Amino acid sequence: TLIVTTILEEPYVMYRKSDKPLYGNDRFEGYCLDLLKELSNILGFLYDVKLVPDGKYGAQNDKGEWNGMVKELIDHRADLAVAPLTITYVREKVIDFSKPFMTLGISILYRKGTPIDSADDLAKQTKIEYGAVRDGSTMTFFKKSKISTYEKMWAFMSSRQQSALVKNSDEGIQRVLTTDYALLMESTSIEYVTQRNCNLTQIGGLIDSKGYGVGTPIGSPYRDKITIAILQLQEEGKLHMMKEKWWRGNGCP
Amino acid sequence: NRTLIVTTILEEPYVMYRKSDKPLYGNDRFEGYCLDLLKELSNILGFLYDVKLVPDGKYGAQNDKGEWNGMVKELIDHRADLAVAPLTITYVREKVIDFSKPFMTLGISILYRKGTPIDSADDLAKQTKIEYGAVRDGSTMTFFKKSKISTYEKMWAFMSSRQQSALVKNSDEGIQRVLTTDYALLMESTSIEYVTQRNCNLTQIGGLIDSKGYGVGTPIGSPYRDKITIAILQLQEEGKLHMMKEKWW
Ligand SMILES: O=S1(=O)NCN(CCF)c2ccc(Cl)cc21
Ligand SMILES: O=S1(=O)NCN(CCF)c2ccc(Cl)cc21
Ligand SMILES: C=C(C)[C@H]1CN[C@H](C(=O)O)[C@H]1CC(=O)O
Ligand SMILES: C=C(C)[C@H]1CN[C@H](C(=O)O)[C@H]1CC(=O)O
Ligand SMILES: [Cl-]
């Protein structure tokens, strides 16, 4: 029986809707749960899903200490992390990621109706505020970047004691819907959001290329097996079916 | 430290013979995306390397008796330390070697001539006048062979009919077939991109029908695999892989 650490994030992992109190794995549904089910069926393991106690994904502080799901793996409090956990340089040095089960890139979430069409449109002005979820991989992309425009955007994002950043995606979404604000957001989440709320749209294409992967502790004997199962699921068209299932939403033009 | 043996294969624009007016020797024989990648990896990780073309000139597939060939076999048998090529990360291969995380993303798509009303794989699957195929024994052909999706099973039935006459031995052959005859080639999207920049009568039809990547191959248990994965992620986040692709495409 593996311990799986995860985090609430639509539509990957959500509280199931019911009139009775829920317990254990039955508390949850979503893309990641469907994934975990397929993975257990292929590999034959049992699993206990547990929300990550500090409710974080995994980032470093000044002193080099980790938190979130990444920390859970490092400390062996979980065997797998199944969540939209972005595969990044800094994380991959401290955990063993499976190969990606989903591809994505950073893009822009914004309200419909405007001439804005790219990141460059934002970086070369100051009237439109823009930011990212604080300490997420998207923020780290801008902070570590040495590319001109992205350097400029980070300067603005982090200025004024980081007032342009948000603590979570929902806050970002509300901020886009209410004020003159664009959120730098992972493309898969933009796709999800813009098919439920027809007032929102993606601006431009992907500014980078990356994946979500299943996290395991360094040296874990499951990583390679999960990689192999993921490849099987992709080649069978199942990853694609799973995403169609959970991204369908309400439908927007 | 021991000079690493790197198996690879000629394929534009990943690995090509360098154009010079005099004979070439060693690594100097070669240029291309994968040579640039290799050189970036060696600088980050600090290894020396000798590039060696795979003797049988194959990527790596199994025969009836389940025996492997090509670069994959080279790695399995420890005749090479690394494989640096457009070697698709697949289920069957990952079971027998270790791949780094992908340095490039791609999917199967369609190479065809411009000006036609064909718009998707479906369009091809439901007809028989337009011939279509893939490189024999490549990961693309294997995808269709193993698919249980209705459209793709129908396509596999077509491709394998008539003793696989719809298949080609290599991408160059496929490309000429598309240019000359009424033929569509199922081809990796990255290669389509390269071809259509250079052949203005050709285009991609429809989107990607799957999603995968090229990765550096190492023998199972190699200590270079994770190191190379981390180096790849670093190159990616610094935008050098993007630069490298633009350079060669
Ligand atoms: O073959 S993989 O390592 N795992 C399966 N997927 C499909 C889900 F993303 C992808 C996608 C993109 C790239 Cl570059 C690589 C891969
Ligand atoms: O983090 S990775 O495994 N290796 C780095 N890259 C960049 C190579 F394109 C990508 C791209 C797409 C996906 Cl899904 C996954 C990855
Ligand atoms: C939803 C959140 C905060 C996560 C999801 N993947 C990124 C990560 O794994 O860091 C974060 C998003 C982002 O940074 O745009
Ligand atoms: C060019 C060739 C024959 C290779 C390249 N990658 C795939 C592989 O690694 O199998 C093959 C192409 C394909 O099957 O469309
Ligand atoms: Cl990996």
Swiss-Prot record, chain B:
It comes from the Eukaryota. L-glutamate binds at residues 86, 88, 93, 139-140, 188. It is found in: Cell membrane; Postsynaptic cell membrane. Residues 117-249 are extracellular. The modification Phosphoserine is found at residue 160. Glycans are attached at residues 1, 201. Coiled coil: none annotated. Expressed in the olfactory bulb (at protein level). Expressed in subsets of neurons throughout the developing and adult central and peripheral nervous systems. In the CNS principally in the medial amygdaloid nuclei, medial habenulae, pyriform and cingulate cortices, and Purkinje cell layer. Also highly expressed in embryonic and adult dorsal root ganglia. Expressed at high levels in the trigeminal ganglion neurons. The modification Phosphothreonine is found at residue 196. Homotetramer or heterotetramer of pore-forming glutamate receptor subunits. Tetramers may be formed by the dimerization of dimers. Can form functional heteromeric receptors with GRIK4 and GRIK5. Interacts with KLHL17. Belongs to the glutamate-gated ion channel (TC 1.A.10.1) family. GRIK1 subfamily. The postsynaptic actions of Glu are mediated by a variety of receptors that are named according to their selective agonists. This receptor binds domoate > kainate > L-glutamate = quisqualate > CNQX = DNQX > AMPA > dihydrokainate > NMDA. Ionotropic glutamate receptor that functions as a cation-permeable ligand-gated ion channel, gated by L-glutamate and the glutamatergic agonist kainic acid. L-glutamate acts as an excitatory neurotransmitter at many synapses in the central nervous system. Binding of the excitatory neurotransmitter L-glutamate induces a conformation change, leading to the opening of the cation channel, and thereby converts the chemical signal to an electrical impulse. The receptor then desensitizes rapidly and enters a transient inactive state, characterized by the presence of bound agonist. This is Glutamate receptor ionotropic, kainate 1. The chain holds residues 446 to 814 of 949 of the full protein.
